[PDB]
Amino acid sequence: ALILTFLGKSGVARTKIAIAAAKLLASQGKRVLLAGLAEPVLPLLLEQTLTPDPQQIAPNLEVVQFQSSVLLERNWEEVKKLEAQYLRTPIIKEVYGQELVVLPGMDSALALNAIREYDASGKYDTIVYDGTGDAFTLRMLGLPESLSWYVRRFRQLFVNSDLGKTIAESPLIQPLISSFFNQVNNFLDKGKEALADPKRVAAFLVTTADPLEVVSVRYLWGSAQQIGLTIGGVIQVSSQTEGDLSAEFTPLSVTVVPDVTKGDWQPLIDALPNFVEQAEQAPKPITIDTHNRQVRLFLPGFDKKQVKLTQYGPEVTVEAGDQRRNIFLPPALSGRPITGAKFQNNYLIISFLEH
Amino acid sequence: ALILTFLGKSGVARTKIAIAAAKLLASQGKRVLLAGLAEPVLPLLLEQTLTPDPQQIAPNLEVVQFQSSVLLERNWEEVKKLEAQYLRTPIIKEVYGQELVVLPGMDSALALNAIREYDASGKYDTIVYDGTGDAFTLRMLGLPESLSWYVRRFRQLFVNSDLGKTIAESPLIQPLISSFFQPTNQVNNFLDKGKEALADPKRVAAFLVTTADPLEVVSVRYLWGSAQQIGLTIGGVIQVSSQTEGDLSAEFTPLSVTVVPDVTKGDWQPLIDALPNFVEQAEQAPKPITIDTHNRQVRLFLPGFDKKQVKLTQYGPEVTVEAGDQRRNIFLPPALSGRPITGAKFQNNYLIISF
C-alpha cells in the first residue's frame, strides 16, 4: 500500500485533509484505511465512534484509531508467547497487558508496527495516516533506517569483534544460557525500501499563507528529505492571510482547497490533487553521481549555516533540521576528502577529491 | 524552578503565548529561561538566532533551543568518559557522537533531562517550555512516574525469578562481571524527585490554549483529562482569536478562561497585558489526585472524557485507571497500602475510589 500522510502546524486542517483524501480515494475504488491517533476530532468530523479495530464507514473506506494502550497490551501477549517458548521459567507472564504504561517512543513504534501489519496484509491500496504532522512523525517514519544504523553498529562491536568471541566461547556465560533457555535486516530493509519509494510512502505539506506556517512547513520539508520521505506537494488552506505560495515551494505544486462546512465534504474532495502523480514527480531526496564523485541532497528550507557535515572513514553524516542522514559512501567516493559542499537551487552538492 | 508549558492544537499561538509569558515574567523580576524545540517560528518571532545554549535577550530573559542531535551527542561524551573509568577494554570509545541517531522516545528523554539540568542549576525562577503541546508532551512529562512504575512492577519479577535467584546463587557471575570493569535506591530517589516536582503546581503547570472552534475545545478538554492522568496540574485556559465567537467559561469550569489578543508586527504588549496570573491560577486549580487517609478514598480529577471510556481494574498489585490513552497505576500510601477497594464512582468530573 501507499502510506499517505500530511505535515503542518494545525491539526484540525490536517485531519480534514486526511478524511477528504481517504473519501476521494475510496470513491475511486481504492481500498483505503484511514488511521488516526487517540484524539477526539477525527471521530467527531466523521460523526462516528472509532475503535482500535478498523470499521467500515463507506465502501472501500475503513477507519481505525491507534490507542497506544491497546497496541501495547496486544504486543505484550506476543511477548508472553515468546517468553514461554524461549524460556524454561517464565518471568513476566504475571504482568497483565492492561497494566503497562506507555513510554515515549513506544507510541511511535507501536503505531508504525500497526501500519506495517496493515500494509503487509495486502488488504489496502492506500493507508492514510493522520499523525502529528511534525518532527515526531518524521522520527517515526525514519525508524527502519534508524534501527538499521544501530543494528549495524551493535554488530560491529558486541559481536564481529574479539568481544564477540570472548562471549561466543566463554564457558562462563554458555552454561548460563544453556540454563533457563539476519532476519532483522530483511525486516528493516523492507521498511527502508518502502520509505524511499514515493509509490509506497509520501507526505504532503499543509499550510496557510501565514509566513510563520510557511517557514514551518519548509523546515519540515527539508527535515523530511533527510529521512528520505518524498514530499509530493503542498495543500494551501484558508486563513485571514492571502498570498500566492507557488514561489515559496518551487518546484512543488501548491493546491488551494476550500474549507469543510456542516459536513459537506464534496468541495474539498473535488479540489484535492492527484497525490500519486505529484509524489512520483517530486524531487528525489538523494542522488549519487559516481562519475563526478558527488552526492546531491535535496534540502529545501536550509542554508549552509544550518547543515553540518561529518566524515568518518567510509561514512558521511549530514545534520540538518535536527535529523541526521548517514551516507555509506560507495567505491567511487569512499576514502576521498570532501572538497566542497555548496547549495545550488535548494540542492546541497557534496564534492569529493579526485586527486 | 516553575516549569510552565502550554497544550493546544495550533503551534503558532502556543509559541506566541510562551514568548509573551516569558517576557511578562521576566519584566516582573523572575529569572526566566525560554526553551523551544527544533523549529523556526520561535527564532523568527524573537528576531533572534537561537542555539543549543542559553542566550540573554532581555533582562532576566534567556532563550535556548533544544536539538535532540546535540543533546544526544553531549550525553554520549559522558557515556564515553564512563567507559574510560569502569571497563577493562573500551567498546564504544570509537563511536562518534556526531553519528548517533535519535530514536523516538530518546528525543523526549533528552529534552526532559535538559530541563532537569536547567532546573537543578538554580539559575532560573521559571522555565517556559514551548513543546509540542499534545499527548507526546504529556508522555514526556510523565516519564518519572512511568519509569518508577516499570522499576516497581518488574524489579521483583526479575530478582525473585528462578533465573534471578541463580544470578545471585551462581559462581559463573562473579568472575563474569569481573571479566570487565543500592542502585535501586538511587534510581527511585532520582525518579521520586521528578514525581514530586510534577505533582507540585509550584514546580510544574500547564495551561490550555484554544479557539472557540468546538473542535479545538473538545481537543483541549481531552488533553486536560489526559494531563490529570499523568499528574500534571492544568491551571487555566487561554482563549485566542478565530472566526468563531463564544464564551468558553462554562466549557472549562472551574478553570479561568482568559481571552487574549493576537500579536501583529512585533507589538507584544497587548498579549502581555492580557495574560493571566499563571502562578495563582495553578495554585487554585483542581488537584489531579488527592489521597484522603481519613475517609480512605482516592479522588482523581478526570474532566473531558466519556465516563464509559474510563476503566478501573486491579489486574496486578495496584489499581489501574485507564483514560485518555494513558494509564495510572495508583501507589497506595501508608494510610491506604494493603486495603482492598470497596467501591468507586464519578461526580463533578472526579472519580472517587473507596477503600
Author numbering:
A (entry chain A): 2 to 182, 196 to 369
B (entry chain B): 2 to 182, 193 to 366
Task: Show the paper's wording.
In AtGet3d, the α-helical CBD is enclosed by additional helices not seen in the deposited Get3d structure from Nostoc sp.. With this map, we could clearly identify additional density consistent with the helices of AtGet3d that enclosed the CBD. We built into this density adding 41 residues total and further refined the NosGet3d structure with refinement statistics in Table S1. As with AtGet3d, NosGet3d has some unidentified densities in the hydrophobic chamber. One prominent difference is that the helices enclosing the CBD in NosGet3d are further from the bottom of the chamber than in AtGet3d, resulting in a larger hydrophobic chamber. In cytoplasmic Get3 proteins, it has been shown that the highly conserved aspartate in switch I coordinates a water, helping to align the water for nucleophilic attack on the γ-phosphate. The catalytic aspartate in Get3, D57 in yeast, coordinates water and primes it for nucleophilic attack of the γ-phosphate of ATP. This residue is highly conserved in Get3d proteins; however, it is a glutamate in NosGet3d, which may contribute to its lower Vmax. To investigate this, the ATPase activities of AtGet3d and NosGet3d were determined by monitoring the phosphate produced by Get3d in a spectrophotometric assay.
Both homologs have ATPase activity and are capable of binding TA proteins, supporting a potential role in TA protein targeting.
